[PDB]
């Protein structure tokens, strides 16, 4: 639902998901128009999180970028009327588009985090996260804090 506080404030419930993108151009489109889409399986998972969590955070990592480009809040359920067809033919293999509010654009490398593993993903290194991988709230909160502390990038510039 709607945000009733800042995503960094402690009293709200949060879930944190890693989003992978094969194309930087898709990230640029997401920043430009506040929109994302994911696989049908991830769409259901994110939908169930969206209705039952105060804030759903999406941590964006382009394939082979070596890290994160920023993070955003999921703002709506998948919506067939939101920017229909914006992604081109891949739209046909995805769930419906949903609104995203980008909350930080930055550069941070997985290797700057040292030996970080995800106990919710078989204790695998953060770099091996797949699209839709959930991270525990203590780690997710820290990743968003560390990203927020970095200088803001203007990735569209």
Numbering used by the authors: 433 to 589
From the study:
We identify the core polyadenylation complex within T. gondii and establish CPSF4 as a reader for m6A-modified mRNAs, via a YTH domain within its C-terminus, a feature which is shared with plants. In the CPSF complex, the T. gondii CPSF4 subunit can be distinguished as one holding a unique architecture which interestingly is shared with the plant CPSF30L family, and it constitutes a co-occurrence of three zinc fingers and a conserved YTH domain. Overall, the CPSF4 YTH domain folds into a well-structured domain featuring six alpha helices (α1–6) and five beta sheets (β1–5). In parallel to the orthodox 3’end processing mechanism which occurs independently of the m6A modification, we propose the existence in T. gondii of an m6A-dependent polyadenylation through which the m6A site would guide the polyadenylation machinery, via the ability of the CPSF4 YTH to bind this modification, thus allowing the recognition of the respective m6A-dependent polyadenylation site, and the proper termination at a relevant locus.
To validate the biochemical function of the YTH domain contained within CPSF4 (predicted from residues 434 to 598), we undertook to recombinantly express the domain in E. coli with an N-terminal TEV cleavable 8*His tag with minimized extremities so as to limit disordered regions and obtained pure and monodisperse preparation of the protein. TgCPSF4-YTH (aa 434–598), as used in the ITC experiments generated distinct crystal forms: Apo, m6A bound and m6A modified 7-mer RNA bound which all diffracted to high resolutions (up to 1.45 Å for the RNA bound form), sometimes using fully automated upstream crystal harvesting (using the EMBL crystal direct technology) and automated crystal diffraction (using MASSIF-1 at the ESRF). The binding of m6A favors crystal growth in P1 symmetry instead of a P41212 symmetry, however, the binding event does not induce important conformational changes within the protein, the N-terminal residues (ranging from 437 to 446) fold as random coils on opposite sides, most likely as a consequence of crystal packing. (C) Cartoon and stick superposition of the m6A-bound CPSF-4 YTH (green/yellow/blue) against the apo form (white) visualized in UCSF Chimera.
